[PDB]
């Protein structure tokens, strides 16, 4: 009844399985990344590091049976995704809704993850935006109000306001955001000094129009170019001030593959290493 951890999954063919990731008991959210191809005349495509999309169906259900929420992340660190036209936004919204956020209907749906129904969509938009991402969020949010309830989340970089997602975050549409306090020395843990990190956190927690702000950290030094902060340091230096915010959601970890190696979340939670 204390720390919620969101974790990205799908980043390595050889990673701990989705079902085993959920079985750790360490995570409140598992975020499958990524639908990294869409927009500009492209057909939608997943890059989930060679994992079988249809094979995820029972694993997603297992996760959900363990009261882990499972999201699909759109965009990702890189990839041929864009959302320049209003039609692109409509198309992506409908595709996501029909294939991932509703039970199957008819026979024409591609159902990448089979008959699984996901708990929401994560906006990990790292280039291009703000584009038509506001319209995409508007249409998905409309669906949130007209059928199955699901979450909308975002993964901005740590400079407030985010260049790709800042305007969409300002609409208050996201249930939660996890800020990437890494690959960005100006707003991350750096030179063994947390001042810039804590200044950035203060701003995000004050200004981000969302009920829950999570702090995103790398799970291992190799998981990001910069910004790794050891788990004892996060507990000691970040948590007392972060917990003073009514918006404190917990932490997000990049990513399950590396967390399996490092046992970062085990250390955060005080579970045996």
Residue numbers in the entry: 1 to 273
What does the published report state?
The XAIP-II and XAIP are two forms of a protein that possess two independent interaction sites and inhibits two structurally unrelated enzymes xylanase GH11 and α- amylase GH13. The polypeptide chain of XAIP-II adopts the triosephosphate isomerase (TIM) barrel folding with an eight stranded β-sheet that forms an inner circle while the nine α-helices constitute the outer loop. Because of the presence of an additional α-helix α8' (residues, 255-261) this protein is grouped in the subclass of family 18C proteins (GH18C) of the glycosyl hydrolases (GH 18) family. Hevamine also belongs to glycosyl hydrolase (GH) family 18C and has the characteristic combination of residues Asp125, Glu127 and Tyr183 for chitinase activity whereas the corresponding residues in XAIP-II are His124, Glu126 and Tyr182 indicating a loss of chitinase activity.
We have determined the structure of a new form of xylanase GH11 and α-amylase GH13 inhibitor protein (XAIP-II) at 1.2Ǻ resolution. The two forms, XAIP-II and XAIP show a sequence homology of 87% while 13% sequence variations occur mostly in the regions of ligand binding sites. The plateau line represents the steady state equilibrium phase of the interactions between the inhibitor and the enzymes whereas the decrease in RU from the plateau represents dissociation phase. As seen from Figures 2A and 2B, the dissociation phase is slower in the case of α-amylase than that of xylanase indicating a stronger interaction between XAIP-II and α-amylase GH13 (3.4 × 10-8 M) than that of XAIP-II and xylanase GH11 (4.2 × 10-6 M) as estimated using BIA evaluation software. The presence of Phe13 at the entrance of the channel in XAIP-II obstructs the entry of carbohydrates to the binding site. As far as the differences between the impaired carbohydrate channels of XAIP-II and XAIP is concerned, the most notable variation is observed in the proximity of chitin binding site where Ala78 in XAIP-II has replaced Lys78 of XAIP. On the other hand, Ala78 in XAIP-II is oriented outwardly from the channel and hence does not exert any effect on the carbohydrate binding channel. The loop α3-β4 is considerably rigid in XAIP-II due to several intra loop interactions and hence lacks the freedom of getting induced fitting upon the binding of xylanase GH11. The insertion of an extra residue alanine at position 105 in the α3-β4 loop and replacements of His106 by Thr107 and Asn98 by Lys98 reduced both structural and chemical complementarities in XAIP-II with respect to the binding site in xylanase GH11 resulting in the formation of a less number of interactions with xylanase GH11.
